[PDB]
């Protein structure tokens, strides 16, 4: 944890002339404002203010004044800004005029579930995300095209894979920002890319994801490309998800890892798996929040389709990578990169604690390709399906109690409400598909 | 009813040189073959044959030989063919190599329900359809555009309404074919048109609808236009439905019309209304068979949204026009022009007979604008909603028993099966809407 | 600079229909020499009665100074409801629908933010206007109507007439006439500036009154 004179010393020592205070609305979009260094004890005295009317999911126009309280632990400088315009950043939580934190701030809300988990004996909730993304070419006037940067596949090399330097450039700015980058490569789909980085505290992991996406889209544009984290932007090729590798620690204890078992898993980790499977239908709407999200949750693309766990398996909802030890984890593959990381985490966490709190029994693993399983054959072993559309996700959300717990009223309410207009709007448009499949035949 | 020497005399007297035998597959598409007059006792001896493998909804490639049995009552000549190439037409039912009628022929299937209704005391099942349609401009190479012929509205005149002569031309060919045309006008939406004609026997009414559409699309093309019966081809304007005005007759008895009641309805007509409301969810999938069909079953466009009846009302599922007397009818507004007329009729008929057979009690009428009714306020008076998507229509179909009765196994089965692939295919594509609403924001 | 970036900056009140207009909010205060004469540290509100008298001031005369603070025909396509621009004469704290908003900041930051002004206004005239409107409320010590602490856009005519909320002038012409009866504004600009602003803008209006929009041709030229 950093001091207030910690960051006072930092702005002198590096001559940081501008400060970007950041936070996150309900859809997971970074929102921020730049302030000259001149203003640094307004920001440090927490007297920074903004307008909640114009933030989706926050507040009404008559209740609109809101405050930013910076979190000094988040401090970081941008390795490409420098000189007369060197820029530094602080992520903030949102406070009301009360002086009290805002019930509707996704991030403070994660901090809230994390106390419900340190009350059950655990030090940290560690997350390692796998945010995949596509790269599209830009046109003369700087706007995206439907033309992917390459037509390469998994682990391909240049010139089959042309995102090489862009990913390199992304990595070095990320590296020069504090990330421990783990790997960088081309994923399965044409123009699809992956850059993995090391796990971190529940809150700082999401802080990481929201910075990750900021850097991907900014460098991508400099390379004359458009980066999208849209779950499934083209039909018939792999979508891109955000796999959430997750683990509880008892202070350098990997509490999921039993060191003499042959499969190497404690069963407080077994019970965790039980709760996320019990509540999977419940939280899908926050881990798959677009209508586009469900066009990626169809079989055949290494995306979770049915609710089940297995090891060394990319067909199921929950993989347990072969890696054990301090790296023993469960990878939750449903989440896609459009999900609000802070909220997706609170849902998965509380879903896993109501799995231990309730001492729940794990189901048996499906060590098969689930996509090759007959509907009746999978109904035989009793495996549920995930919601097939955002509407069905929504209604499964208002049935599940564990999710309202994880999100609270203001967020739970402002979410069902907003994602139901996006469904209404979408269930009125006429797709090129119908017109293309119906207007001449009928 | 006509004789075989009836039509022998007809081909001599007019010198009809070509014969078009017609029938209908499961999606309501006219299928036919032209035969020289040379072949007229092959056709009359029922020795005409074709291939059921290549007809959707019929039969397998190993069971493929099928026969046509013409229905001589249907005879009609085309008032635009003449001379060396004068053409005449006979609608046929499909028979197997058995000699027995094909279980899967929508039309013979209507004839089958009609015997289940003359066994309950009624002479005819009379239908008057209102098939609405749009007119799109063609381009240089003869292919449709998204440009409507006019930007007129209801009952408009030229030059605001430019479909005048086309509709005229349609009417005179229709008139010269035996239709008693009733009215012709521009309906609510831009480039939308209506041409009503007088009611007829259950079977000949559908025979009429399938000819209607044939003539609309043929004249429309000569006028350099493209006619579509797509339910909802553009968002934000009125779709076009096929209102089914329906009545039972006891031989010139309008059995729906009570002549001293003030509202003028017998209650064998009241019980009929009860059964179509009891089974509405069941048969929607056949009266609204496209995914496009449900983009028209959204509130605000004079299309049925919730299951309810009223009089003088275009907001509800079932209208009872002010017209009483020999014209007392219930108009069933859900049906849209993409529905197979023969099948839509069997569903609505059997739905209404299980309403009298079961002596069912009518509900109370909603004499209001149902679209202005709060969701909870309409849940208060207990009015169901129609299926919001073709998938929900399908599953409501496999629950309802009255519909499997109306369609039989081969048709019921071949329908759930085929319209579920069209849903699968459609619930995999990525709409310009998502890419347009998601690819830059995420 | 915007040009040096191949861009074009405009302070036009609402260059585009259907999205927020750009307004030039005037947060103002009165000082008695290093101390914010708007801020009472004892009371819970945070406001002295000079701040109350002062806003009673601008509220009372808002109709009169509106033409000067919203001086283009375009100005009045921003005073449409629903875009965080005001269109009713009212005041609230913490609230962005009303004419005057008073921010949560107190201490040396206590102030009234007059949301009416748009960036097309002549700052020295608008400020001269608001200052004397306030100065009127201070030397007649008017007492302030009670605040309107809801979204003032979602209120019906019946619901606003009840509480006594006057609209601001809908058009520039109507704003000019509001300007000719309000006498406090005439002393604010002086005879010379008052007259020539009125002239200049009266004839600006006449030119707009006679234009034919292609709004109109896109509606009436095929319909009628
Ligand atoms: N104990 C752990 N808890 C949480 N995350 C972990 C743990 N061990 C490793 N990880 C995370 O797993 C991720 C590895 O992802 P990746 O290498 O793409 O896996 P794979 O390719 O097998 O799916 C890293 O992001 C890292 O943070
Ligand atoms: N007794 C009846 N039974 C069945 N159909 C009828 C009866 N009387 C009239 N019709 C039909 O009603 C239709 C009238 O449709 P239309 O004039 O467009 O009605 P509206 O415009 O009021 O909806 C005709 O197609 C006609 O066949
Ligand atoms: C080869 S893949 O395994 C495919 C990811 C998939 N497109 C998804 O939607 O999660 N994922 P990874 O190697 O990143 O764990
Ligand atoms: C004015 S309308 O009443 C509108 C028909 C609507 N578009 C529908 O989908 O049925 N129908 P009609 O006058 O043909 O009975
Ligand atoms: C949310 S807004 O509050 C919008 C004001 C708008 N531009 C207008 O005055 O039309 N402005 P700000 O928070 O900068 O005061
Ligand atoms: Mg808002
Ligand atoms: Mg650098
Ligand atoms: Mg990986
Ligand atoms: Mg993974
Ligand atoms: Mg076939
Ligand atoms: Mg002719
Ligand atoms: Mg009509
Ligand atoms: Mg009708
Ligand atoms: Mg402001």
From TrEMBL, chain C:
Q: What is its main location?
A: cytoplasm
Keywords attached to this Swiss-Prot or TrEMBL record, sorted alphabetically, are:
ATP-binding, Cytoplasm, Ligase, Magnesium, Metal-binding, Nucleotide-binding, Phosphoprotein
Give the cofactor note text: Binds 2 Mg(2+) ions per subunit.
Q: Which residues carry this modification: O-AMP-tyrosine?
A: 153
Q: Which residues bind ATP?
A: 96
- Which example biological process does GO assign this protein? glutamine biosynthetic process
Q: What is its EC number?
A: 6.3.1.2
Q: Which residues bind Mg(2+) 1?
A: 25, 113
Residues binding L-glutamine: 21, 25, 78, 84
Q: Give the residues the record marks as binding ADP 3.
A: 29, 36, 101, 108-109
Domain of life of the source: Bacteria
| Reaction it catalyzes | L-glutamate + NH4(+) + ATP = L-glutamine + ADP + phosphate + H(+)
Residues noted as binding Mg(2+) 6 in the record, renumbered to the chain: 25, 113
Annotated binding of Mg(2+) 7, by residue: 40, 49
**Which cofactor does the UniProt annotation name?**
Mg(2+)
Residues at which L-glutamate binds: 20-21, 78, 84, 96, 115
Return the similarity comment. Belongs to the glutamine synthetase family.
Tell me how this protein assembles: Oligomer of 12 subunits arranged in the form of two hexagons. In its feedback-inhibited form, interacts with TnrA in order to block its DNA-binding activity.
Please give the function described in this protein's UniProt entry: Glutamine synthetase (GS) is an unusual multitasking protein that functions as an enzyme, a transcription coregulator, and a chaperone in ammonium assimilation and in the regulation of genes involved in nitrogen metabolism. It catalyzes the ATP-dependent biosynthesis of glutamine from glutamate and ammonia. Feedback-inhibited GlnA also interacts with and regulates the activity of the transcriptional regulator TnrA. During nitrogen limitation, TnrA is in its DNA-binding active state and turns on the transcription of genes required for nitrogen assimilation.
Q: What is this protein called?
A: Glutamine synthetase
Section covered of the full-length record: 223 to 446 of 446
């Amino acid at each position: 944890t950093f001091t207030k004179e910690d960051i006072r010393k930092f702005v002198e020592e590096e001559n940081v002339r501008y400060l970007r205070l950041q936070f996150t609305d309900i859809l997971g979009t970074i929102k921020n404002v730049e302030v000259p260094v001149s203003q640094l004890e307004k920001v440090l005295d927490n007297e920074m203010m903004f307008d909640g009317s114009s933030i989706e999911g926050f507040v009404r126009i008559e209740e609109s004044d809101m405050y930013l309280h910076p979190d000094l632990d988040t401090w970081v400088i941008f390795p490409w800004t420098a000189g007369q315009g060197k820029v530094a950043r602080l992520i903030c939580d949102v406070y009301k005029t009360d002086g009290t934190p805002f019930e509707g701030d996704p991030r403070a809300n994660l901090k809230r579930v994390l106390k419900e988990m340190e009350d059950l004996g655990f030090t940290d909730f560690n997350l390692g995300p796998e945010p995949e993304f596509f790269l599209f070419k830009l046109d003369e006037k700087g706007e995206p095209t439907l033309e992917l940067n390459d037509d390469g596949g998994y682990f391909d090399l240049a010139p089959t894979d042309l995102g090489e330097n862009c990913r390199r450039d992304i990595v070095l700015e990320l590296e020069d920002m504090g990330f421990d980058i783990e790997a960088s490569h081309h994923e399965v789909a044409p123009g699809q890319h992956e850059i993995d980085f090391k796990y971190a505290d529940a809150v700082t992991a999401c802080d990481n994801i929201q910075t990750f996406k900021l850097v991907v889209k900014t460098i991508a544009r400099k390379h004359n490309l458009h980066a999208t984290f849209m779950p499934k932007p083209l039909f018939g090729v792999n979508g891109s998800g955000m796999h959430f590798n997750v683990s509880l620690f008892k202070g350098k204890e990997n509490a999921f890892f039993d060191p003499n078992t042959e499969m190497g898993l404690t069963e407080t980790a077994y019970q965790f798996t039980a709760g996320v499977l019990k509540n999977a239908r419940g939280f899908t709407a926050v881990c798959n929040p677009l209508v586009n999200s469900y066009k990626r949750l169809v079989p055949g693309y290494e995306a979770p389709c049915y609710i089940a766990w297995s090891g060394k398996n990319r067909s199921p909802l929950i993989r347990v990578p072969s890696s054990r030890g301090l790296s023993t984890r469960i990878e939750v593959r449903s989440v896609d990169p459009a999900a609000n990381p802070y909220m997706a985490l609170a849902a998965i966490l509380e879903a896993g604690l109501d799995g231990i709190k309730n001492k729940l029994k794990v189901p048996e693993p499906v060590n098969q390709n689930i996509y090759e399983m007959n509907r009746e054959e999978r109904e035989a072993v009793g495996i549920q399906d995930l919601p097939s559309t955002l509407y069905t996700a929504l209604k499964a959300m208002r049935e599940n109690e564990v999710i309202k717990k994880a999100l609270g009223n203001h967020i739970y309410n402002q979410f069902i409400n907003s994602k139901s207009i996006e469904w209404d709007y979408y269930r009125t448009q006429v797709s090129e598909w119908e017109r293309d499949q119906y207007m001449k035949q009928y």
